[PDB]
C-alpha cells in the first residue's frame, strides 16, 4: 500500500500540526511496514529498496529541521497567536522527531539483529582515508551522520 501510492508518499516526505501528525502516522506506518523481509517474498525488490532509501533520506532530513536552529523559528512563528493549537503543534513537532526516528532507527536495529550487523562486511566498510531514477546507489557515511545527529538530538531531547 505504501508503494501503490509512491507518488504521494514521496510528495509528503519532501514537503503545521496537521502536517506533523501526517508525518507521524506515515513514519509510524513505515517502520512497522518497511521491513526487507517483505522484499524477498527483482522488479519489486528494487522498487521497494528505492522506497526504503527514500524514507531513510527523508527521515534524516528531519533532524536538521527539528534538531537545529530552525526549531526556534517554528515555535516563534506560532507565537503571533499561540493558542492551545500552537502548543499542540510543537508536541507533534516533537512527536515527529521522536516517533519518526525511533521507529526508523528501531527498524534499523531489527534489520541489524536479523543479519548480525552485516556479518560478512569484512570488505572495508570505510574507505582508507532528483526524481527516482531507474537505479540509485546509497551511501554508508550516512550511518555516521545519523549517529552524530542522534547523539546530538539525544541531549536536546533530554
Amino acid at each position: 500500500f505504501l508503494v501503490a501510492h509512491s507518488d504521494t508518499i514521496q510528495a509528503i516526505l519532501r514537503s503545521s500540526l496537521g502536517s506533523l501528525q501526517e508525518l507521524a502516522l506515515l513514519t509510524g506506518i513505515i517502520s512497522k511496514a518497511a521491513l526487507p523481509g517483505v522484499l524477498n517474498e527483482d522488479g519489486s525488490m528494487m522498487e521497494l529498496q528505492g522506497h526504503i532509501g527514500r524514507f531513510q533520506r527523508q527521515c534524516l532530513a528531519l533532524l536538521n529541521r527539528f534538531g537545529g536552529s530552525d526549531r526556534l523559528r517554528q515555535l516563534s512563528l506560532q507565537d503571533d497567536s499561540s493558542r492551545l493549537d500552537g502548543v499542540s503543534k510543537k508536541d507533534d513537532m516533537e512527536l515527529a522527531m521522536q516517533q519518526i526516528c525511533s521507529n526508523v532507527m528501531e527498524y534499523c536495529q531489527a534489520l541489524m539483529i536479523q543479519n548480525s550487523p552485516s556479518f560478512q562486511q569484512t570488505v572495508c566498510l570505510f574507505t582508507p582515508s532528483s526524481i527516482l531514477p531507474s537505479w540509485r546507489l546509497p551511501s554508508l557515511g550516512v550511518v555516521i551522520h545519523l549517529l552524530k545527529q542522534s547523539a546530538n538530538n539525544f541531549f536536546t531531547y533530554y
Partner: protein, 52 residues
C-alpha cells in the same frame, strides 16, 4: 419558534458527532504509538542483555 427548535436539534447532533470522532481518533493513535514504544523498549533491552 421552529427556527429555535431546529437549530437546537442541529446543535445536539453536531455535539454527538464531534464526541465520537474525537474519542475514536484519540484512542486509536494513542494506542498505536504507546504499543510501538513499549515493544521497542522491551525488545531492545532484552536483546542487548542477551548479546552481552
Amino acid at each position: 419558534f421552529l427556527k429555535n427548535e431546529k437549530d437546537n436539534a442541529l446543535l445536539s447532533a453536531i455535539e454527538e458527532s464531534r464526541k465520537r470522532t474525537f474519542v475514536m481518533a484519540e484512542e486509536y493513535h494513542r494506542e498505536s504509538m504507546l504499543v510501538e514504544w513499549e515493544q521497542v523498549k522491551q525488545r531492545v533491552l532484552h536483546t542487548l542483555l542477551a548479546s552481552g
